[PDB]
């Protein structure tokens, strides 16, 4: 195990005046080496996604992006007020391949069903990572990587209810958020497909907790970026209520909603809470033009309640998130420098 400053790789377009392409062109390289990954037969290697120094470096890179990219109108940080120009700019995350310099190497776990922590009896040697988009969101991981086999749930400690459960889906669920043109938005999720998706998540949770009843609930409360599904779509911050998504009971039925497809009440806020460090930030009014963005729910961030005393009758899970590091561990769990 070692730690060195890694570089990155992207198909960034210099001619594109969008923040991700501009930054990547100025701080990355098209690459790549060919053709495959050097497989290591009969070699076991231990991994630890919940302590990978790769995520920390990436986290600082994602932050450094927003700093020179989205310029807020007002910035409140530790009793400090900062006002500045806030021009609107195209904002679309671009896949980034973090590569290792000369001298070191990157071990990749080929095991399709890998929890992220433990022995891996099928590793390899890669020069750089795969396509990883800087998706900043909460509750629902967007535009990530699907599982090659079954859905996989991960947690630094399933026992500790204060920990996050990084869920990976094997089948992507499409979500359509559009602002018609008032300044209000709404999202669309196939009720049929999303159902079975919850089913799959349930049988996995029920499996990890020997024998209990799985029941989803809305957010227990907190900040608007935690209570609702917060995400960036076209340089705008959306806050969509997902009380309809996480409201089902598993253990023989309970509550089924219909109406063909699910529609979530959403809205755009100018005053948001910074995800980088502690503080707030106000931005410019919504764009007069229309905003269409269709994303892909390939992952979920859930938090378990449970615990207390006197046996168990049922478990409860809620849409979690917040720490964007969890969003990177869903893509960098099978890598090791």
């Amino acid at each position, epitope marked *: 195990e070692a730690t060195t400053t890694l570089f990155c790789a992207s198909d960034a377009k*210099a001619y594109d005046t969008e923040v991700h392409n501009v930054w990547a062109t100025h701080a990355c390289v098209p690459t790549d080496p060919n053709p495959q990954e050097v497989v290591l037969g009969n070699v076991t290697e231990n991994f630890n996604m919940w302590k990978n120094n790769m995520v920390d470096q990436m986290h600082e890179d994602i932050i450094s992006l927003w700093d020179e990219s989205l310029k807020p109108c007002v910035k409140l940080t530790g009793g400090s007020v900062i006002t500045q120009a806030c021009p609107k700019v195209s904002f679309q995350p671009i896949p980034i391949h973090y590569c290792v310099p000369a001298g070191f190497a990157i071990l990749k776990c080929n095991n399709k069903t890998f929890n992220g922590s433990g022995p891996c009896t099928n590793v390899s040697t890669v020069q750089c990572t795969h396509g990883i988009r800087p998706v900043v969101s909460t509750q629902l991981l967007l535009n990530g990587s699907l599982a090659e086999e079954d859905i996989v749930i991960r947690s630094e400690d399933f026992t500790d209810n204060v920990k996050t459960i990084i869920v990976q889906l094997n089948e992507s669920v499409v979500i359509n958020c559009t602002r018609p043109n008032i300044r209000q938005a709404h999202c669309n999720i196939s009720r049929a497909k999303w159902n079975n998706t919850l089913q799959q998540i349930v049988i996995k949770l029920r499996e990890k907790f020997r024998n209990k009843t799985i029941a989803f609930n809305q957010s227990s409360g907190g900040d608007p970026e935690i209570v609702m599904h917060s995400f960036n779509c076209g340089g705008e911050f959306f806050y969509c209520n997902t009380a309809q998504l996480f409201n089902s009971t598993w253990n023989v039925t309970n509550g089924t909603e219909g109406n063909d497809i699910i529609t979530l009440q959403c809205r755009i806020k100018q005053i948001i809470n910074m995800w980088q460090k502690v503080g707030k930030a106000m931005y410019a009014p919504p764009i007069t033009g229309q905003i269409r963005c269709s994303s892909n729910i390939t992952g979920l961030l859930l938090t378990r309640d449970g615990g207390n005393s006197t046996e168990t009758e049922t478990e409860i899970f809620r849409p979690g998130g917040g720490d964007m590091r969890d969003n990177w561990r869903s893509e960098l769990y099978k890598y090791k420098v």
Partner: antibody
Amino acid sequence: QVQLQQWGAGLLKPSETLSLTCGVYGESLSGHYWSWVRQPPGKRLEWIGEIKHNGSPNYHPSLKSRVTISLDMSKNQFSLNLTSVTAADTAVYFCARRSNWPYLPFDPWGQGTLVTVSS
Amino acid sequence: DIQMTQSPSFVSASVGDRVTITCRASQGISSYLAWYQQKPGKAPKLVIYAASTLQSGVPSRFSGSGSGTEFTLTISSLQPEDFATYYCQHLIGLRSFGQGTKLEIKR
């Protein structure tokens, strides 16, 4: 060893099109990029763009709407388009190979082709 | 956009003398720089890349250093063939070069 040769019309007129071709001898186009770099008379060099064997080009911001780089994988050669040329396009265009990270420097280079646009 | 300015633009040094040309950047670029040697009616020749990494074949008298904004290309002992025009390049971003430094003989 590898040598990059360049051929094409040097003397051009306004509104016309620049079409230069750089041939590769001693190496295949595979596993390597191929970029064009011009240099105005008595000025710094300027990276125009580079194309990959996959077909995805990477042009310069102010030259995207005119520059078009392709690949002739059958003859191991690549070309450089430039629609609607003007007097400001008068320069010596070069062609160089760009390897993969960490190796990025342009190498080898071509002998260059002097281009002049006049009416 | 990052600007690359070299200094001086015109160096006068006799053969065998020690010469040192600099290249300042408007913004931080770490170690994404290269140097090239170009003679009249000829194409540039890669001298030193990665700011301080010498190209295969390049004489030992050629050396480079610096990181961030300030950079340096030093030649221990000059030779009749060393006299030419040197350019500095931002290996990434817009791949912009410098106005170049023309090294000539002194009399």
